[PDB]
Write a protein that binds this ligand. Structure first.
Ligand SMILES: COCCN1C(=O)N[C@@](CCO)(Cc2ccc(F)cc2)C1=O
Length: 130
């Protein structure tokens, strides 16, 4: 229905706002663009499913996310890709892992504080019905 399409547009507007707040945070600058194959050719071979905040904005605009649960899976992937590719005892690696964990924790805390559980439940029920 038109009503359900309005509900999904509402969800996309909220997801664009959360993603913009993460992308302007100086800590998360490394997560704002895909890894440049020139600089890191080792990456696309170690990392099977690359994800960054620019690509998240792309997935929202293409209607790939119908639930907050769907969105958070891609946040979790940004974080899990950084921890798996930078596991070394080495300050540079420790710094990116701390920032990746802070990105994940921030996104979960915004959604916990701001979004009503009944709105997510609604978005899920429309998804399941299709
Ligand atoms: C927006 O769509 C979901 C409906 N909704 C919520 O889930 N929490 C609030 C308030 C509780 O009523 C607040 C809020 C407003 C705008 C948002 F983008 C996000 C959250 C709300 O208005």
């Amino acid at each position: 229905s038109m009503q359900e399409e309005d509900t999904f547009r509402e969800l996309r507007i909220f997801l664009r706002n959360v993603t913009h707040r993460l992308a302007i945070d100086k800590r998360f600058r490394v997560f704002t663009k895909p890894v440049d194959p020139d600089e890191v050719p080792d990456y696309r071979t170690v990392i099977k499913e690359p994800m960054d905040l620019s690509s998240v904005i792309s997935k929202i605009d293409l209607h790939k996310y119908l639930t907050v649960k769907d969105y958070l899976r891609d946040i979790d992937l940004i974080c899990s890709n950084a921890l798996e590719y930078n596991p070394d005892r080495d300050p540079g690696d420790r710094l990116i892992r701390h920032r990746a964990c802070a990105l994940r924790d921030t996104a979960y805390a915004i959604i916990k504080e701001e979004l009503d559980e009944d709105f997510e439940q609604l978005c899920e029920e429309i998804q399941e019905s299709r």
